[PDB]
């Protein structure tokens, strides 16, 4: 019971930090692609200068993979390893498409094609990010139920 | 004994995702300022084009404010508001310094002064970022024992 709860809680905190990191990528894609800081609106449009943001996006992406490496549980091993492959495929795609993403002047369209998972066309990484998102979300569902059934040890066996 | 364990975990998850967002700024500040994607190294140097990166930093910064606003706990009320106040000073400072931060060609130095809290000089927002990290962590410290004392009630 006590060993169950503390160890089961660790993974949920572990997984939900990955989801928080993913939302950092998703949020800059939705609200910061093609934008600049403005004193009143907070952000203002600046088209086709998304180069440094993509580096920051990839920066968070590799921080995500490191955290996926720190997750270890025999029950969740299959879903964590499946999550392990997906972030690696995403990070590799940004490397693969460096000719369009490795400059300061990356177009909005190609920037969105890389990190905006809700974009129309998703051939520069957004497919892999969504595939990654689904793998991570499949992990939260299994990890959350592992915690709850550890706590369902309050009433009923 | 049943409700509190679930309730405090909600508080812990809420705070630790703020820090996880807080960690998203830092890592981009540490590894992406003055950088570009490279097919082999993963990142390579590209100086003085940090505008969209810093715009992204502020984007997560206001996502942090949204998350601190969703926090409500009677005990942590004074400390949550303090983290709320700190988040606004950071976001206000970044917009306040738009003359240097709102363009594609923000220098590497100015970006580090804005979002790299361990930089040498911190006159463009990193000071307010430091205060924000410190205010949130005092909130994280309180939340950790808030959960733990719920579970040490088994023996």
């Amino acid at each position, epitope marked *: 019971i006590s060993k169950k709860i503390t160890d089961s809680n660790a993974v949920l905190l572990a997984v939900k930090e990955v989801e928080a990191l993913l939302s950092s990528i998703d949020e800059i894609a939705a609200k910061a692609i093609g934008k600049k800081i403005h004193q009143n609106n907070g952000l203002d449009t600046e088209n086709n200068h998304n180069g440094s943001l993509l580096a920051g996006a990839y920066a968070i992406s590799t921080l995500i993979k490191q955290k996926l490496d720190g997750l270890k549980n025999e029950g969740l091993k299959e879903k964590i390893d499946a999550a392990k492959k997906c972030s690696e495929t995403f990070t590799n795609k940004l490397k693969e498409k460096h000719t369009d993403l490795g400059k300061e002047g990356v177009t909005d369209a190609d920037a969105k094609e890389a990190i905006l998972k809700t974009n129309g066309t998703k051939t520069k990484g957004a497919e892999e990010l969504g595939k990654l998102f689904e793998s991570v*979300e499949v992990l939260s569902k299994a990890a959350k139920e592992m915690l709850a059934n550890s706590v369902k040890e309050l009433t009923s066996p | 004994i049943s409700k509190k364990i679930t309730d405090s975990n909600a508080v812990l998850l809420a705070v630790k995702e703020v820090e996880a967002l807080l960690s998203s700024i830092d890592e981009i500040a540490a590894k992406a300022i003055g950088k570009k994607i490279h097919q082999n190294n993963g990142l390579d140097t590209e100086n003085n084009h940090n505008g969209s990166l810093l715009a992204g930093a502020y984007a997560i910064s206001t996502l942090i404010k949204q998350k601190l606003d969703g926090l409500k706990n009677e005990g942590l009320k004074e400390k949550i508001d303090a983290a709320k106040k700190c988040s606004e000073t950071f976001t206000n400072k970044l917009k306040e310094k738009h003359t240097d931060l709102g363009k594609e060609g923000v220098t590497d130095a100015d970006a580090k002064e804005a979002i790299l809290k361990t930089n040498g000089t911190k006159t463009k927002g990193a000071e307010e970022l430091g205060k924000l990290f410190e205010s949130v962590e005092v909130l994280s410290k309180a939340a950790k024992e808030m959960l733990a004392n719920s579970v040490k009630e088994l023996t």
Partner: antibody
Amino acid sequence: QLQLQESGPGLVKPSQTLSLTCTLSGGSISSTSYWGWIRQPPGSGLEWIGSMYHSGNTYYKSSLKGRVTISLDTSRTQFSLRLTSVTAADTAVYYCARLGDVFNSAMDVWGQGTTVIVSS
Amino acid sequence: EIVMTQSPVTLSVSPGERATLSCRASQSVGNNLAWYQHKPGQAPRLLIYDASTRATGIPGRFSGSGSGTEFTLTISSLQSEDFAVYYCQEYNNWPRYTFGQGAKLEIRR
């Protein structure tokens, strides 16, 4: 605190699209997640419409497949229901509700309910 | 192809007596079932989840068994407020649900 508040216009013409927005109050898309919509047609019980995720991945009842789309608003105060095209058998009361949590998952914080009538 | 069937569609019990609502699944939804109260004019309330556990805030008169395809919600000594329709709910594919028809609970006279 955990407060769900319903949406705009009912009285939509048949074969049109009814669009509803569920807006959060005192709450955010956090830990990092809330989802889902529920409806009750007259003379009939409740039935689930669809579910979402904080990322945005959606799952539908599959008799509304192709018909429904659930959407997440960036600046994530709210999420929307989109139903098209609408029969008179779509006239119902539509609820948005938080269908999740760490320790119970389904189906926990409900909206107040909004009425949408599909008639000419 | 997951079917939830409440045993009587309407149930009539005099106030203060025991009520036994039943829910049956066409196949095991396992340990994943919910019970709701819905008074006309309000949103449905969540009463039970995981088929045994009550959402905190609801009185001790409500209780639930489960663990497979048998499912029952019992209100011992139901009071004036307790007369409403009660639905059961499958969530064994958690983002995906199926309600039941509901079961009105009538004042018996």
